[PDB]
Symmetry: none
Subunit: 186 residues, 2 copies
């Protein structure tokens, strides 16, 4: 069964393809731009995206939005994680966190799926903490400064398979896969 | 002011840290195992736990025990909520409640606190009902099938802040905070 993943993020495609590929699912990246609205929830961005894309791309298709939410920073950068990463980057987050009593944060992923004229959403959350230094050559974004709960390594020190086994995206993909199994029986 | 929370439940740590953190209290999780005795009251489990831990962990420290008490089931699973959840789970409770005339139940939380060689306890109770279906991606345990009185959402459909504003644990934490204010003036 093939699923078209509308995204411009190669790293995300690799993580999604790695996880689902093990279950006979073929992920096909489709670079079709769509508006990502400003909103207080990743789910709202995904809802608008699906509504904008339907009828314009092959089906079934999926999109995804994710972000890092830092407790001591009231959830920042959250929905705007990509922009913040491109501007202030890892250095900026570490600067903001200097002297922070609480370095806890969570990553969240929301997957939107569209098939037979209906939209569905799946989400995943992984709590952890912001490290005091960047480490790792894998992943992308804030992976070098995020250590998931129960681990001694940052996401960037993990392989795609290892990251998927613990990440927000991996959890969203697990829920997504279960739904696919049950509803499509592909 | 820091308080060591002796527990192996990450979800509970997050709820406690969220509530008290807003008042300048730093919660530090300490994973030190202690015996949780079989008893007919959460308070008895907490009393034994504190007595077993004192002198072994830094101070001041706190522990907590909680459970779901279903009216039509004579208070079950109560003190053994964790074990019952791990075995029969949400499905088991819903199965037991099929055809139930009365779906009322309450959640109770008891916090034990030890400082300067003395133990103190604080409790909270929130009544509600068992839903006929699980809903929600937040929380843990029976949160997906418990709707607190005055709400249209299950605990699992609420954020930590929203849950704390209505839950048994939130009420116990409120009593705890008031005591801290008055007796420690930190």
């Amino acid at each position: 069964m093939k699923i078209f993943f509308i995204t411009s993020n190669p790293g995300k495609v690799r993580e999604v393809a790695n996880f689902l590929g093990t279950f006979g699912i073929e992920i096909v990246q489709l670079k079709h731009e769509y508006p990502e609205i400003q909103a207080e929830k990743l789910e709202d961005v995904v809802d608008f995206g699906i509504s904008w894309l339907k009828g314009k791309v092959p089906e079934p298709f999926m999109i995804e939005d994710s972000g890092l939410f830092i407790e001591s920073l009231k959830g920042f950068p959250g929905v705007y994680s990509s922009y913040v990463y491109r501007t202030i980057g890892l250095e900026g987050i570490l600067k903001l966190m200097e002297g922070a009593e609480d370095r806890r944060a969570y990553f969240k992923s929301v997957i939107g799926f569209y098939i037979d004229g209906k939209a569905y959403k799946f989400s995943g959350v992984t709590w952890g903490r912001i490290s005091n230094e960047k480490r790792g050559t894998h992943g992308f974004g804030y992976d070098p400064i995020f250590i998931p709960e129960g681990s001694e390594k940052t996401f960037a020190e993990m392989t795609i398979e290892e990251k998927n086994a613990l990440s927000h995206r991996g959890k969203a993909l697990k829920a997504f896969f279960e739904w696919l199994k049950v509803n499509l029986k592909y």
